[PDB]
Design an enzyme around this catalytic site. Structure first.
Site, PDB file in Angstrom:
ATOM      1  N   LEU A  10      64.274  17.467  15.275  1.00 20.24           N
ATOM      2  CA  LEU A  10      64.209  16.648  16.478  1.00 20.24           C
ATOM      3  C   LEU A  10      63.423  17.247  17.626  1.00 20.24           C
ATOM      4  CD1 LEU A  10      67.748  15.078  16.625  1.00 20.24           C
ATOM      5  CD2 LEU A  10      65.699  14.196  15.658  1.00 20.24           C
ATOM      6  N   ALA A  11      62.310  17.906  17.303  1.00 19.02           N
ATOM      7  CA  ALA A  11      61.277  18.229  18.288  1.00 19.02           C
ATOM      8  C   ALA A  11      60.647  16.858  18.644  1.00 19.02           C
ATOM      9  CB  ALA A  11      60.226  19.141  17.670  1.00 19.02           C
ATOM     10  N   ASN A  32      69.644  17.620  12.711  1.00 19.69           N
ATOM     11  CA  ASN A  32      68.873  18.760  13.217  1.00 19.69           C
ATOM     12  C   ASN A  32      69.838  19.948  13.064  1.00 19.69           C
ATOM     13  OD1 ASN A  32      66.437  19.710  14.965  1.00 19.69           O
ATOM     14  ND2 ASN A  32      68.204  20.513  16.075  1.00 19.69           N
ATOM     15  N   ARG A  33      69.423  21.213  12.893  1.00 19.07           N
ATOM     16  CA  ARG A  33      70.407  22.263  12.654  1.00 19.07           C
ATOM     17  C   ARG A  33      71.145  22.697  13.929  1.00 19.07           C
ATOM     18  NH1 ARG A  33      67.475  27.694  13.028  1.00 19.07           N
ATOM     19  NH2 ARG A  33      66.417  27.276  15.001  1.00 19.07           N
ATOM     20  N   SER A 128      49.443  13.351  11.229  1.00 23.14           N
ATOM     21  CA  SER A 128      48.485  13.665  12.264  1.00 23.14           C
ATOM     22  C   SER A 128      48.583  12.575  13.301  1.00 23.14           C
ATOM     23  CB  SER A 128      47.046  13.728  11.711  1.00 23.14           C
ATOM     24  OG  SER A 128      46.150  14.347  12.640  1.00 23.14           O
ATOM     25  N   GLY A 130      49.700  13.799  16.628  1.00 21.88           N
ATOM     26  CA  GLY A 130      50.427  14.434  17.707  1.00 21.88           C
ATOM     27  C   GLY A 130      51.525  13.480  18.158  1.00 21.88           C
ATOM     28  N   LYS A 183      45.352  17.425   4.539  1.00 20.05           N
ATOM     29  CA  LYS A 183      45.741  17.686   5.916  1.00 20.05           C
ATOM     30  C   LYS A 183      45.067  18.933   6.486  1.00 20.05           C
ATOM     31  CE  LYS A 183      48.233  18.016   9.635  1.00 20.05           C
ATOM     32  NZ  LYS A 183      47.544  17.580  10.863  1.00 20.05           N
ATOM     33  N   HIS A 186      41.520  18.292   7.142  1.00 21.61           N
ATOM     34  CA  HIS A 186      41.390  17.490   8.348  1.00 21.61           C
ATOM     35  C   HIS A 186      41.298  18.384   9.588  1.00 21.61           C
ATOM     36  CE1 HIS A 186      42.657  15.093  11.729  1.00 21.61           C
ATOM     37  NE2 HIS A 186      43.524  16.058  11.866  1.00 21.61           N
ATOM     38  N   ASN A 187      42.231  19.304   9.685  1.00 14.31           N
ATOM     39  CA  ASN A 187      42.279  20.239  10.796  1.00 14.31           C
ATOM     40  C   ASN A 187      41.076  21.138  10.804  1.00 14.31           C
ATOM     41  OD1 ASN A 187      44.857  19.226  11.172  1.00 14.31           O
ATOM     42  ND2 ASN A 187      45.780  21.212  11.399  1.00 14.31           N
ATOM     43  N   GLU A 190      38.507  19.223  12.295  1.00 21.29           N
ATOM     44  CA  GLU A 190      38.856  19.042  13.697  1.00 21.29           C
ATOM     45  C   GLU A 190      38.311  20.229  14.478  1.00 21.29           C
ATOM     46  OE1 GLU A 190      43.286  18.189  14.381  1.00 21.29           O
ATOM     47  OE2 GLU A 190      42.866  20.124  15.328  1.00 21.29           O
ATOM     48  N   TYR A 191      38.469  21.437  13.929  1.00 19.82           N
ATOM     49  CA  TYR A 191      37.931  22.643  14.559  1.00 19.82           C
ATOM     50  C   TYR A 191      36.429  22.539  14.738  1.00 19.82           C
ATOM     51  CZ  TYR A 191      42.017  25.830  13.918  1.00 19.82           C
ATOM     52  OH  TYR A 191      43.232  26.456  13.975  1.00 19.82           O
ATOM     53  N   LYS A 260      46.719  27.800  15.253  1.00 24.86           N
ATOM     54  CA  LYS A 260      47.952  28.027  14.519  1.00 24.86           C
ATOM     55  C   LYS A 260      47.620  27.986  13.009  1.00 24.86           C
ATOM     56  CE  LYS A 260      51.136  28.262  17.304  1.00 24.86           C
ATOM     57  NZ  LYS A 260      51.310  29.355  18.303  1.00 24.86           N
ATOM     58  N   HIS A 452      23.361  43.965 -13.703  1.00 27.18           N
ATOM     59  CA  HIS A 452      24.163  42.752 -13.919  1.00 27.18           C
ATOM     60  C   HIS A 452      23.634  41.655 -14.825  1.00 27.18           C
ATOM     61  CE1 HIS A 452      27.171  44.107 -11.131  1.00 27.18           C
ATOM     62  NE2 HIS A 452      26.229  44.284 -10.216  1.00 27.18           N
TER      63      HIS A 452
HETATM   64  N1  LIG Z   1      53.889  18.172  19.978  1.00 28.73           N
HETATM   65  C1  LIG Z   1      54.481  17.940  18.814  1.00 28.73           C
HETATM   66  O1  LIG Z   1      55.620  17.440  18.758  1.00 28.73           O
HETATM   67  C2  LIG Z   1      53.688  18.312  17.552  1.00 28.73           C
HETATM   68  C3  LIG Z   1      52.283  18.404  17.559  1.00 28.73           C
HETATM   69  C4  LIG Z   1      51.576  18.740  16.396  1.00 28.73           C
HETATM   70  C5  LIG Z   1      52.258  18.963  15.198  1.00 28.73           C
HETATM   71  N2  LIG Z   1      53.668  18.843  15.156  1.00 28.73           N
HETATM   72  C6  LIG Z   1      54.388  18.755  13.853  1.00 28.73           C
HETATM   73  O2  LIG Z   1      55.844  18.812  13.903  1.00 28.73           O
HETATM   74  C7  LIG Z   1      56.305  19.971  13.155  1.00 28.73           C
HETATM   75  C8  LIG Z   1      57.523  20.648  13.784  1.00 28.73           C
HETATM   76  O3  LIG Z   1      57.572  20.513  15.218  1.00 28.73           O
HETATM   77  P1  LIG Z   1      56.870  21.611  16.188  1.00 28.73           P
HETATM   78  O4  LIG Z   1      55.388  21.567  16.034  1.00 28.73           O
HETATM   79  O5  LIG Z   1      57.465  21.490  17.552  1.00 28.73           O
HETATM   80  O6  LIG Z   1      57.321  23.014  15.538  1.00 28.73           O
HETATM   81  P2  LIG Z   1      58.621  23.933  15.727  1.00 28.73           P
HETATM   82  O7  LIG Z   1      58.350  25.298  15.199  1.00 28.73           O
HETATM   83  O8  LIG Z   1      59.161  23.836  17.118  1.00 28.73           O
HETATM   84  O9  LIG Z   1      59.656  23.176  14.745  1.00 28.73           O
HETATM   85  C9  LIG Z   1      60.819  22.574  15.345  1.00 28.73           C
HETATM   86  C10 LIG Z   1      61.904  22.286  14.315  1.00 28.73           C
HETATM   87  O10 LIG Z   1      62.089  23.391  13.397  1.00 28.73           O
HETATM   88  C11 LIG Z   1      63.498  23.508  13.175  1.00 28.73           C
HETATM   89  N3  LIG Z   1      63.815  24.831  12.598  1.00 28.73           N
HETATM   90  C12 LIG Z   1      63.378  26.003  13.058  1.00 28.73           C
HETATM   91 BR1  LIG Z   1      62.242  26.216  14.535  1.00 28.73          BR
HETATM   92  N4  LIG Z   1      63.872  27.010  12.318  1.00 28.73           N
HETATM   93  C13 LIG Z   1      64.617  26.409  11.415  1.00 28.73           C
HETATM   94  C14 LIG Z   1      65.399  27.085  10.471  1.00 28.73           C
HETATM   95  N5  LIG Z   1      65.399  28.422  10.408  1.00 28.73           N
HETATM   96  N6  LIG Z   1      66.158  26.319   9.665  1.00 28.73           N
HETATM   97  C15 LIG Z   1      66.136  24.982   9.784  1.00 28.73           C
HETATM   98  N7  LIG Z   1      65.387  24.340  10.703  1.00 28.73           N
HETATM   99  C16 LIG Z   1      64.620  25.045  11.541  1.00 28.73           C
HETATM  100  C17 LIG Z   1      64.030  23.266  14.569  1.00 28.73           C
HETATM  101  O11 LIG Z   1      65.426  23.024  14.629  1.00 28.73           O
HETATM  102  P3  LIG Z   1      66.116  23.515  16.004  1.00 28.73           P
HETATM  103  O12 LIG Z   1      65.387  22.803  17.084  1.00 28.73           O
HETATM  104  O13 LIG Z   1      67.527  23.067  15.820  1.00 28.73           O
HETATM  105  O14 LIG Z   1      65.868  24.978  16.016  1.00 28.73           O
HETATM  106  C18 LIG Z   1      63.234  22.052  15.012  1.00 28.73           C
HETATM  107  O15 LIG Z   1      63.867  20.855  14.545  1.00 28.73           O
HETATM  108  C19 LIG Z   1      55.089  20.883  13.022  1.00 28.73           C
HETATM  109  O16 LIG Z   1      55.098  21.683  11.830  1.00 28.73           O
HETATM  110  C20 LIG Z   1      53.993  19.831  12.855  1.00 28.73           C
HETATM  111  O17 LIG Z   1      53.991  19.257  11.531  1.00 28.73           O
HETATM  112  C21 LIG Z   1      54.360  18.540  16.355  1.00 28.73           C
END
Ligand SMILES: NC(=O)c1ccc[n+]([C@@H]2O[C@H](COP(=O)([O-])OP(=O)(O)OC[C@H]3O[C@@H](n4c(Br)nc5c(N)ncnc54)[C@H](OP(=O)(O)O)[C@@H]3O)[C@@H](O)[C@H]2O)c1
Ligand SMILES: NC(=O)c1ccc[n+]([C@@H]2O[C@H](COP(=O)([O-])OP(=O)(O)OC[C@H]3O[C@@H](n4c(Br)nc5c(N)ncnc54)[C@H](OP(=O)(O)O)[C@@H]3O)[C@@H](O)[C@H]2O)c1
Lengths: 473, 473
Positions: A10-11, A32-33, A128, A130, A183, A186-187, A190-191, A260, A452
């Site tokens: 739940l980010a 979410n954990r 993709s 964001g 994917k 793609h990135n 993007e670079y 990243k 060679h």
């Molecule tokens: N701006 C954006 O939202 C954005 C942009 C681009 C890509 N992404 C995509 O979303 C994905 C994840 O979100 P993020 O980029 O903010 O990356 P994060 O590294 O912030 O991942 C956040 C999630 O990882 C979970 N998590 C972690 Br951290 N450690 C864990 C563990 N040890 N066990 C189980 N769950 C765990 C967190 O749960 P918790 O919160 O309870 O710790 C949270 O739900 C990325 O890999 C990518 O694919 C997001």
């Protein structure tokens, strides 16, 4: 059994995706954990919706309609395995786990297989767009165990971005780590687009002596041509942006680009599979170069440039030349792009549909542009097209940019403006064009000091070693 | 106990090394897994020597004076582990196994550690020179468990090449996989020098309309200047070489360069540790480009070049310009080279002596030249030198080549001659020179669509995210 699917993570990304699904009328149960966030979300962002909340994985699990399908949007590595570990005791055969994080394609391959012998259908989707995109329409590139597809199809396709014809920017990519490989390419690309724009920007600034206002003018003028795209649009906006104090914000920002890891991985895989993807590679090393900011300051004090010669020529013609040079180099980077995709398809045995992939990048995603449409055209007319440069549209496009692209590089070169991606694209174009290259000299010297052995032009296949040491003596 | 050391692996390399040791008055006992070859060698190449032969590993083992020291010259991977597996039951504590093959530095790291807990001293030496060198004096780059060093010192140093002062081109490189990492960087650079020479060759040929006789003339003239080196010497010879039928041999050779992986690995490690080694990277992709020979033939028929404009200028001035451009780009490739070495030293905690390494490449090895001497000078005056371009000799050298290097690239660029390594070296030089780069724009757009956050020029350290979306609305 009420939830059609679950999402764990739940980010903002997860959060938005859940909402986007909700608007399309799918009951999601979130988890979410750090479980407090499930409440936080249900109270705040999600109030008023159909989304259910779960406080235990086993609770989430009992919520699900069968086949159970849950999505992981957790950041990569260890974490994803651990979630997987826990979910397996609790799942039946025929159940589905989806990995939406940016996972290494070899991990997706491993997990997909391992799980198949445990009877669980696993898919790796690249996501993709964001935040913005996750809320209204991301592009989703799903690969892995094909059985899963029909069960998630209507969901994935329904929440994806769609271009004008109504096509979702999402379809089944292929086996194992296909979705996650695509994917990362793609990135990688993007670079590439970003570095090219920086180069275009650096010539306007330093040679043409343009100011950020005219520069944004130029970029939004260009976004009305073949360069119509998301990264050109946002660069126009970025250049005009006035900070609190009235001044432009951009020249206040520190020039140390991050990454990243995805663009880097693209360049690793190209080096591993022997594919000359030179522009994404130059792009990645450019970002590493910008990290040595202190070194560069130290260097500017000691290292001289070219004798200063002004630009006695025409600002608006040259501006046109820069546009062309950019466009041409964009084409090269993409051809190198789809080459890697082709090689991968052959090394892992995936049947990739390249026209499909192009459509999946025409919407939602950061590299979206009109240009992807013109690539799609190529692979419909010819699914078997070997290299994109051979397609009539693109060969016509690059010869049309010939004089400008070489003019711009040359002027850049006199002025001392670093153009790593403009130059590799021209070197690659000139390299690929030549049916005969000085690589013969390489072959000869390898055979000289290292024995060679070499092939002859005619009689390709039989190997010879010459005693070169002395032709006598 | 009569043999001072054993060598396992009787390909020409092993064979020559054994003989070279023998001339320095060390009794070697040879062994090989197809044991017939031990006889074959004792009868033929080795008759008259002091070398003993072994028919069983345990026989070889009983032959040895203590500390037992045996060398593996077996091709890489699985094979080396298997030899190791067998040797451990049979060895005592304090005994020494050496790996002279081109092993992956991570394997050397693994094996070295694993063995240390088993009480066996393990070293990984890079060997260079080829057959020629293995017979009279290779350069040997040994790394691994330091305890071993004093026991092999006199041998290693005695059989190595030595430059004029009497220094052996061999000393202890450092821990774990140091010797084998250095070795792969050597080869990476070797790739780099070769591609540059090809580029130099391609301009003489296609622009200057020179013939192989004058071209060899030019190269041997150049080998009398700062470019005095082994790969320039042999290219002069290669260009003059008349085939059986009178014609020159070189244009008969197929232009598909091979590679047995080392140069590639160098480029992987640079991408992994974030070091911008752009020229070895361009070199590796150039060899991959030349492998698509059929594609290139197909491409030449469809892809147009520049409008044909002759070279109305002076052949001998331009020839001078090409020399300069080559020399300058050579310097860049080496600076990028020692950067990677420095980063590695910091990521694995090795205390590398860079002046030492340079001396170890000044003799025996394929990249040997006078140039390495001038690099050595730099690190003696300053062991702490951060980048080679900062050293006075090299900064003077490159500004002296400024006008020619940019002239050559520019003419190349109009003519359509592929110069991937000449261009990345100029792009990198211009990049590193600038204290401010358009990487700020990269940082701004990453923060726009992905919210990654940015730093300000002043106040480096605190991160900000701007809502760019609209400055209002
Ligand atoms: N701006 C954006 O939202 C954005 C942009 C681009 C890509 N992404 C995509 O979303 C994905 C994840 O979100 P993020 O980029 O903010 O990356 P994060 O590294 O912030 O991942 C956040 C999630 O990882 C979970 N998590 C972690 Br951290 N450690 C864990 C563990 N040890 N066990 C189980 N769950 C765990 C967190 O749960 P918790 O919160 O309870 O710790 C949270 O739900 C990325 O890999 C990518 O694919 C997001
Ligand atoms: N021209 C040259 O001589 C030259 C040039 C450049 C570098 N090198 C160096 O010499 C090294 C080896 O010689 P090479 O380049 O000819 O490479 P090769 O691949 O031919 O290695 C030859 C050696 O590997 C041994 N070997 C093999 Br193959 N498989 C083995 C196994 N499964 N178990 C145990 N031993 C095994 C062979 O024993 P067998 O013969 O009984 O099978 C032979 O002694 C290279 O790695 C490199 O460091 C040599």
């Amino acid at each position: 059994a009420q939830a059609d699917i679950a999402l764990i993570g739940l980010a903002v990304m997860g959060q938005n995706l859940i909402l986007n699904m909700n608007d399309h009328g799918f009951v999601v149960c979130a988890f979410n954990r750090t479980v407090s966030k499930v409440d936080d979300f249900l109270a705040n962002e999600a109030k008023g919706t159909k989304v259910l909340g779960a406080h235990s994985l086993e609770e989430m699990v009992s919520k699900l309609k069968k086949p159970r399908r849950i999505i992981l949007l957790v950041k990569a590595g260890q974490a994803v395995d651990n979630f997987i570990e826990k979910l397996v005791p609790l799942l039946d055969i025929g159940d589905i786990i989806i990995d939406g994080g940016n996972s290494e394609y070899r991990d997706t391959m491993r997990r997909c297989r391992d799980l198949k012998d445990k009877g669980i259908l696993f898919v790796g989707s690249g996501v993709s767009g964001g935040e913005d995109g996750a809320r209204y329409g991301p592009s989703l590139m799903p690969g892995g165990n094909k059985e899963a597809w029909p069960h998630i199809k209507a969901i994935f396709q329904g929440i994806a971005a769609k271009v004008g014809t109504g096509e979702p920017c999402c379809d089944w990519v292929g086996d194992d780590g296909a979705g996650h490989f695509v994917k990362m390419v793609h990135n990688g690309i993007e670079y590439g687009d970003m570095q090219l724009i920086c180069e275009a920007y650096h010539l306007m600034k330093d040679v043409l002596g343009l100011g950020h206002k005219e520069m944004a003018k130029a970029f939004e003028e260009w976004n009305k041509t073949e360069l119509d795209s998301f990264l050109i649009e946002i660069t126009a906006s970025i250049l005009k942006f006035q900070d609190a104090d009235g001044k432009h914000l951009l020249p206040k920002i520190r020039d140390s680009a991050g990454q990243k890891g995805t663009g880097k991985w693209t360049a690793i895989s190209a080096l591993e599979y022997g594919v000359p993807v030179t522009l994404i590679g130059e792009a990645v090393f450019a970002r590493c170069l910008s990290s040595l900011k202190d070194e560069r300051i130290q260097a500017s004090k000691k290292l001289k440039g070219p004798q200063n010669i002004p630009f006695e020529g025409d600002k608006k013609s040259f501006l046109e030349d820069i546009r062309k040079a950019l466009y041409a180099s964009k084409i090269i980077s993409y051809a190198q792009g789809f080459m890697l995709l082709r090689q991968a398809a052959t090394e892992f045995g995936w049947t990739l549909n390249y026209g499909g992939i192009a459509l999946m990048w025409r919407g939602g995603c950061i590299i979206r542009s009109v240009f992807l449409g013109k690539i799609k055209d190529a692979f419909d007319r010819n699914p078997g097209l070997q290299n994109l440069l051979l397609d009539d549209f693109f060969k016509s496009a690059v010869e049309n940019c010939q004089d400008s692209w070489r003019r711009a590089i040359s002027t850049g070169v006199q002025a001392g403006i670093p153009m790593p991606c403009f130059t590799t694209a021209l070197s690659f174009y000139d390299g690929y064009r030549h049916a005969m290259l000085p690589a013969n000299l390489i072959q000869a010297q390898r055979d000289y000091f290292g024995a060679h052995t070499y092939e002859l032009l005619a009689k390709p296949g039989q190997f010879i070693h010459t005693n070169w040491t002395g032709h006598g003596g």
